[model samples]
Target: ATLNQLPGRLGDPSMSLGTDPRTDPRLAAALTQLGLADQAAEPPVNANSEVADCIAYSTAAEQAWQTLFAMLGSQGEPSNPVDVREETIKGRGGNEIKLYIHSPTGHTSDSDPLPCVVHTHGGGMVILTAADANYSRWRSELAATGLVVVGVEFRNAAGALGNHPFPAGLHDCADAAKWVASNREALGISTLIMSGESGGGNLSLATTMLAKKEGWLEEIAGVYAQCPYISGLYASKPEELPSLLENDAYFWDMKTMGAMVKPYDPTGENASNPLAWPYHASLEDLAGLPPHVISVNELDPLRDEGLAHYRKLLKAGVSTVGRTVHGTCHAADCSFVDVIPDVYFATVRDISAFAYSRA
Candidate 1:
C-alpha cells in the first residue's frame, strides 16, 4: 500500500506498512541504529524486535522527511534563488548574534514594509546555526509568502559564558525581536511574527512572553510555534512518553532532550519563570498577547504539552488556531516536502495565509 493509503490513526498518514525500507536510506539507518534492521527485512514482526523495529522504522521515516529539506539547496548569497542575507545583533555580553534573512526580491512592495517573521532554529538548545538546508527550505517557502524571514543563530548550550540554558537562549531571541522592531524601517518590515520548530518553538513562545512583559507585544503580529518544547518539566521523567521510546533517532530524543535541559531544573530557583517554560505561566499572563498558530504532531512526545498550551491560549481567550497533523511525529512536517510535496506546500500556504490574515 502507498503512504497515502495508510490510515491516519496510525500516527503517520504518509507511512505505509509495505513501505520499502531500502527506498528510504534514513529509515534504514534509523532501523539499524535501533537494532531492528534484520527484523525489518522480514514482513512479519517478531516479539523480540517489536519495540526496536517500530522505533527504527519510525525514526528512519522521520529522518528521510527531514533529509529532503536539508538537501534542498535553500541557503546562500542574496543572488541565490532564495535571496539569503546575513545580519548581526549585538547582545548583552558583547556577543554578536547572527541572523539570516530571506526575502524574495520579486515580491518587494514599496507601498508598505513587508511583514517580518523572526524564526529560531530548532536543535533542543544544542544547535546554533540556521545555515543548513532544512532552514533554507523554510526561508524559501516563507519568503514566497511576501514575508521577510529572519532566522536567529543564537548561542548554543555549549557556547560562551557557560550560560546556555533556557533564559539564556530566550534572552537572545527576545533581544533579536527587539532589534528587529527597532530596525523595522531599515529592514523594510512593518509587522512582526515570531516562529520556530521544536526547541526553537519553545524559545519562540518564551520570547513572546518576554516581549509582552517588556511591553513589546504591540510590535508583534502573532507567533507560530511548531511542536514547541514548552515543558522542561519532562526532563526529569523523559521515559514517560511512548513516542520518545518509539522514535529515538531524530535530533531530539529523550536522551538529548534530558541533557539539553539538565541545566534548567523546574524545581530550582527561577525554574517556573515564563522564560524557562511558558506553559507554567498563568493564562491571565497571556492576556492581550499576540495571536498564536501552533502545529503539533499526534505521535510526538511533546504532543500533549503543545496541546495543553494551545488549550491554555483558548482558555485565556487569546486568538489562536492549532492543527494537529494526523499520523505524524515531531518536526515531521519539515521532511514532508520531499515525500508529500503537496502537503508540505499546503502547510506553508496555510501558515502564510494565517499570518497575512492577521497582518
Candidate 2:
C-alpha cells in the first residue's frame, strides 16, 4: 500500500502538532538531523557491530534523538481523563523520574486497591519519554481499564550525568517499580505490572531481570515488551536482522542502530556480563522470572531478538505470550496509534488481565 493508503484519516484538522515549543522542538530537531524535516521519519534497522563501530553510532543516534525531541512541542501536561496525578520517583543519581499515576477513575472499591502499570518509553535507549504521544495512548487505554499507569522517564545515555551505560537506565526502571510497590498504599495500587516498547521494552526486561535477582518478582504481575531489543549485541549474521527482507524502505539503518547501542557494549572483563546484554544471561537466570507479554513487528530489526527472548522465557518456565503484527514496523505502535488501535488496546488488556489474575 502507498503511504497515503496505509490507514487512518490523512488530514485530521483536529489533530495538529500543537503550538507548545517544548513539545514541538524535539520533533523538529529529530527531523532536521535525519534530513527528513520535510518528510516522515522511519525506524532503524539492525546491523553488525564491533566495539569501536558500535560506540560511535550509538552516540550519534543519541544526539539525533535528543535534537529531535528538543524541537518538538509538548501537548501540555496530560489530563488524567481518569483523575490521575503527576508524581516523581526519586533516584539515586539525583535524576527526576516522572510518572503519571492513574487513579481507579471511579472504579475504586472498598474491597481492594487498584492495579498499577509502570510504563517505560521507547527510543532505542536514547529517545522518548512517558509523556510521548504513543505512550499516552496506552496510558489512556490502561487507565480506562481501572489500572493505575505510571509512565517512567528514566535517564538516557546522551544527557545522563553519570559515566555509566547499560544497566544505568535499566537500574532506574527497576528501582521505580520497587518504589511503587513500597508505596503501593500511597499510590492506591495493589498490584504492579511493567510495560514498555522498543528500548522501553529492553528496559522492562532488564528491570524484570533485576527484580528476579533482587527477589522482587513476587511483587510484579507481568511484563509487556513491544519490539524489544532483548539482545544488546546486534545480530551480525544476515539471517538475524529480518527487517532487511520485509521492509526495504525502513528508516533505521545499520549506522543508525550501531550508534544507538554503542555506549552499552560490554568491554574487556565486562564482555561476559549479562547486565550489558540481558539475552546473554543464562536460562537458569531466566527461570522463575515474571510472566510476560511481548509484541513484535515483522518489519523490525529487533523482531528476531525479541522472539528469542520470548522463547527463552518459555523454556525457563516463565509464562509468556507473543504476537507479531504484519505490515507493521518498529516504533510504528507509538507513531501510528490511529491506524493500530489493537496494538495499544492489546497491551492494556494483557497487562491488566495479568495483574488481575495475580491479584
RMSD per model, one decimal: 8.1, 8.4
The residue-level lDDT of candidate 2 at 339 comes to 40
Cα-based TM-score, every candidate: 0.74, 0.74
Clash pairs, model 1 backbone: 11-327, 11-328, 12-327, 27-60, 65-335
On residues 69-172, what C-alpha lDDT tens digit does candidate 1 reach at each position? 45533433222355678898898667888888887765444537777888887766544357767776776678767778888877655423233545667778
Ten-residue region with minimum lDDT total, candidate 1: 39-48
lDDT of 2 at 107: 49
For model 2, how does the per-residue alpha-carbon lDDT over 289-318 read when each residue is reduced to its tens digit? Answer: 777888887555567777887888898898
Q: Show where candidate 2 strays beyond 4 Å.
A: 1-80, 93-96, 104-112, 159-164, 238-249, 266-272
Candidate no. 1 TM-score: 0.74
Over 4 Å off, model 1:
1-81, 106-112, 159-163, 236-252, 263-270
